[PDB]
Amino acid sequence: NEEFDCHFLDEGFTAKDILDQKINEVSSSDDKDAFYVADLGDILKKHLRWLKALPRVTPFYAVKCNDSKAIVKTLAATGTGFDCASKTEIQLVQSLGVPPERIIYANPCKQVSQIKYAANNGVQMMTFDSEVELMKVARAHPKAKLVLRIATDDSKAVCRLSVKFGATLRTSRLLLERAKELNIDVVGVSFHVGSGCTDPETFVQAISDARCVFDMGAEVGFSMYLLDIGGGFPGSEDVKLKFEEITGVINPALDKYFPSDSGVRIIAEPGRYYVASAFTLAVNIIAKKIVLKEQTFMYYVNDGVYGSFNCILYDHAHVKPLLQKRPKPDEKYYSSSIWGPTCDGLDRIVERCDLPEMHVGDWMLFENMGAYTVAAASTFNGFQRPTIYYVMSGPAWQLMQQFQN
Amino acid sequence: MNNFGNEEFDCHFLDEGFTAKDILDQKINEVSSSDDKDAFYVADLGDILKKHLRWLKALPRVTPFYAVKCNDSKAIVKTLAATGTGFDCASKTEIQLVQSLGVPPERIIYANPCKQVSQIKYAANNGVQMMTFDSEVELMKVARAHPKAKLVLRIATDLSVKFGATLRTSRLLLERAKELNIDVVGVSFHVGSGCTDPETFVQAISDARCVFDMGAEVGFSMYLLDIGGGFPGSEDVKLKFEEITGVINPALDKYFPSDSGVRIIAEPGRYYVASAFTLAVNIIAKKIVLKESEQTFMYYVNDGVYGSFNCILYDHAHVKPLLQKRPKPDEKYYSSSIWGPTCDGLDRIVERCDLPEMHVGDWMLFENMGAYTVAAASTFNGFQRPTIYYVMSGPAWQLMQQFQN
Ligand SMILES: Cc1ncc(COP(=O)(O)O)c(CNOC[C@@H]2CCNC2)c1O
Ligand SMILES: Cc1ncc(COP(=O)(O)O)c(CNOC[C@@H]2CCNC2)c1O
């Protein structure tokens, strides 16, 4: 099918050039639906970069970030783990041939029937942060390996008084004693610093806290070996806090609190890092209005906040439109807004930006659209999700085969 | 109650003396001793038939065209088509859905002011003649891909930011349409969903009259007046349907008398379906928080802001959780929050409310969940859309048959 359909990327060509080619090919066809170009070679590059930056940390891809079957198949061929939050994601991962020991059910609040499904399919490792979860596990998957998820405080997060997941150290101690009472095996500690991390020092704090809980486990009789540092790493270079800074702050903390001789196994749950920059979205300007204030423009394109751009609300992502052909400096720029296809007035992509005068049929490009865009899109107003074209060069395929070897 | 075959076309009998609430009670009791407690809807089509009867009684001069985007369930569209209402379609997929159920094109209005060219072409190919517009570029596109269309000018009202032409712009649009030999047959407006002041309608109607007169000056024979939607779909509102209709009908008689030959239609979306759907979610997780001991609770249920409750973010909807059994007056209440199945922290249905202490396996009910809830739901994190159980009483079926004749 199209999902499993992969196109060759010839030598000297990038995803950008492929985008330009397809756009030129449909110049006078009049079928100008929005579409993605997904470079799996970018995912292989990200994996190489991860192996180089965090050699002690095994990556478990957060499927909920992008559940595309091609992505999961490529990552499974690469040999990464997978973080699954629901029965459907476990089904997806196992359907591609991944054994259960490469799957972590890292949802702290799981429905009982889904816990039973995880037990039925041999997924042993699950996270938890509450006593009711311990009761449910004892009653539905008693031989599970539990990872205690501890809380982290993020200043940039809107809500800090109420945190959905994560136990405090005080609560963690009681959770460990309760797990010992119920004869449930606790094997490690997990945390999630959050995508909007501004200061890498936070990770260190979390790591320190994790060590503390590890010691607590040693006091209660548990053999703790699994440390899960979660996700939140950036997926593109268009950020102030870059991946390598975070890793350079993390590695000394890991060496200090969890030395290799201790026998600890360190993992992570990066979602956006692997896929963010792999996808580039092309939308077509389907409508245009001119408002006199000085000329300003309202452009309507064929994707919106109910589709790929739901990240504007759910993830609060900031999107900047890109022109296919670069404009000369002398050309005048105008104040413009960009709107979605749906009738709702709340379907606005960009409130105000500077753009040259464009016309219906012109294309706009959005880079770094791999993370939390298609995974949360809906078909409101009947508009279908854009076709995704997967590309991969021969050298990239060779690297993937080497990983299999 | 269990669906057999296809859920979309499966309808269950509602016995005499039974309401949707009783069906909810029965379904909840049926799964009392099992762990498959997925969230589900009960949809009373008889409530939709009641809404249609109420509309016919309140707005005898206004033909309703159901806004398919509010709820695209095939059962809903089938019932309304059997009832003989029109349909407002915003995209190619909605036209496909409506025509697949046997609705002729003259009962379809393409009320999307900014349509992609290929979708205009599709509408032309399938005989849908009537389309809305509010811009000159739209006139160019129509003259190119649908020359014999009947255009309805959408005017601004005090959604207005995204759509709606001013009277000044309306004059130029009518003259430009005359230049391009495009037939303009009427005027449409949308006062907005959940309008606080009914007087707006009067103003809008007045404005419509003006544009009608403009058409008479340029040579158009204007006959179609479209007053849009925005009518409430439940009694749980300050401004009730009958007040709005009591304000609308005199304005229609004053500005568009029946002897003038005008044909008046509307595009009610939420009015027909809002109260017809009741949602049942199961409490899948529970946390107890101590305030320094004042006990507060966090309940995690199996639907969230990525699912049915996306209306909180998109539709500005306030949800009221309801208990299956009415609580005792002396029963103690606690401060509580309600959270979704997904790992995302922002997936919170209710920040704070007063509820008695509940336990995993208990059910919560949400009424008036028919409008803009399932139509914009996604499968983020792999969580599946709730099963919908359609019910209909015998007398409701008799009323539907009377409408069909
Ligand atoms: C438990 C857990 N592990 C990993 C991730 C992935 O985070 P990343 O930033 O690496 O993609 C998550 C996801 N956390 O938040 C996802 C939010 C949903 C919309 N965008 C942010 C979790 O929870
Ligand atoms: C053009 C048009 N006609 C009808 C409707 C339906 O409005 P109603 O309030 O009767 O359901 C609409 C609605 N448009 O957007 C609805 C937004 C989506 C989420 N809540 C607001 C339009 O546009």
Numbering used by the authors:
A (entry chain A): 6 to 298, 311 to 422
B (entry chain B): 1 to 158, 166 to 299, 310 to 422
Manuscript excerpt for this entry:
Ornithine decarboxylase (ODC) is a pyridoxal phosphate (PLP)-dependent enzyme that catalyzes the conversion of ornithine to putrescine, a rate-limiting first step for the tightly regulated biosynthesis of polyamines (putrescine, spermidine, spermine).1−3 At the molecular level, positively charged polyamines interact with negatively charged RNA, DNA, and phospholipids, thereby directly contributing to chromatin biology. We report two X-ray structures of ODC complexed with new ODC inhibitors, computational docking, molecular dynamics, and binding free energy calculations to validate the experimental models. The X-ray structures reveal that covalent adducts with pyridoxal phosphate (PLP) are formed in the active site of the human ODC enzyme, as verified by their preparation and enzymatic testing.
We then turned our attention to the inclusion of the 5-membered pyrrolidine analogs. As before, it is anticipated that the PLP adducts are formed in the active site and are the true inhibitors. To help verify, we have also prepared 10-R-PLP and 10-S-PLP and found that they both demonstrate inhibition of ODC enzymatic activity, with IC50 values of 0.16 and 0.03 μM, respectively. The activity still favors, as observed for 10-R and -S, the S-enantiomer with 8-fold relative activity. In each case, as we saw with APA, the adducts 10-R-PLP (2.9 Å resolution) and 10-S-PLP (2.0 Å resolution) were formed, forming trans-oximes with PLP. The lipophilic cyclic pyrrolidines of 10-R-PLP and -S-PLP, form strong lipophilic interactions with Tyr389 and weaker lipophilic interactions with Phe397, the pyrrolidine rings orientated in an orthogonal manner relative to each other. The basic pyrrolidine amine of each makes a H-bonding interaction with Asp331. Although the structure associated with 10-R-PLP is of lower resolution and does not include water molecules in the structure, a well-defined H-bond network of direct interactions is available, which explains the similarity of activities observed. While there are some small differences between each structure, both networks appear to be equally strong.
